[PDB]
Amino acid sequence: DMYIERAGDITWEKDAEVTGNSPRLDVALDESGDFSLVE
Amino acid sequence: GETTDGVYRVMTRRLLGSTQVGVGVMQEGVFHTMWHVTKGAALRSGEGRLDPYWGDVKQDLVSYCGPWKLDAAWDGLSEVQLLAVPPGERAKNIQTLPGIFKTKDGDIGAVALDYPAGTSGSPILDKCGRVIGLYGNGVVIKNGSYVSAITQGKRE
Ligand SMILES: CNC(=O)[C@H](Nc1ccc2c(c1)C(=O)OC2)c1cc(Cl)cc2[nH]ncc12
């Protein structure tokens, strides 16, 4: 069986670690909910 | 049991020890998570039970106790925060500028942050703290890195 445990409040944190890039990808979504790269 | 608004870990004891298989959002008495986390199975919250209400394999979303409540959307310009809840690790806000998934049915936001699979269901937030979608369904790009979609449901 699965169970849930509270992990915190949902709030924006000012002065948070800014990381990650913004890539524009051509993608496809299938009937099983899986994404795939189109090239 | 506990229905206070917030981010929650989705755990299981079917495997060795206690394993975190995903994350979810409690809002307006509704638990929101990704379909591949629970497979639509019932969840436990202390002594109480949470039964699925709505779900969809193609959207990869599922709600418990009521209809999907999250409807805020990414504005297409601003930075967002992934409130990442990693297994065995404390909740942590990570700020990023989302990219784009261009599909045959329109464009979707995308967050390029690499986290364990048990982090799926973590909410993505706007500057107001509103949940604009969930992290955990995406693609692994050429350089082995992970890129997730900003997956948002529909509020009826
Ligand atoms: C490309 N895979 C994913 O998006 C992973 N989640 C996931 C796993 C299984 C299924 C689905 C989704 C789905 O839709 O049906 C079956 C995943 C999530 C996260 Cl948070 C970090 C990850 N790092 N590598 C992979 C991965």
CATH number of B30's domain: 2.40.10.120
Name the structure determination technique.
Answer: X-ray
Which of B31, B23, B22, B36 lies closest to B1 in space, CA to CA?
B31
* Marked catalytic residue, from B32, B60, B63, B122: B60
DSSP B25-54: EEETTEEEEEHHHHTT--EEETTEEE-EEE
Residue B70 lies in a domain: no
- Report helix, strand or coil for B21: strand
Are the C-beta atoms of residues A7 and B88 closer than 8 Å to each other?
no
Q: Radius of gyration over alpha carbons of chain A, in Å? A: 17
The residue type found at B3 is: T
Place of tokens 């959207």: B59
Are B92 and B129 members of one domain? yes
Q: Which of A14, A15, A27 to mutate to test the interface with B (most CBs of B within 10 A)?
A: A27
Inter-chain touch B14–A10, beta carbons under 8 Å: no
Residue B154 lies in a domain: no
Q: Which residues does B88 contact at the CB level (< 8 Å), separation at least 6?
A: B20
Are B52 and B16 members of one domain? yes
User: Which residues constitute the domain of residue B19?
Assistant: 6-64
Which of B82, B77, B102, B79 lies closest to B92 in space, CA to CA?
B82
- Report helix, strand or coil for B73: coil
The residue type found at B64 is: Y
Q: Which residues does B154 contact at the CB level (< 8 Å), separation at least 6?
A: B68, B71
CB count in 10 Å sphere of residue B24: 30
Are B129 and B91 members of one domain? yes
DSSP alpha helices (H): ranges in chain B?
Answer: 35-38
Partners of A17 in the β-ladder: B94
> Which is it for strands B80-84 and B43-45: parallel, antiparallel or unpaired?
unpaired
Inter-chain touch B11–A2, beta carbons under 8 Å: yes
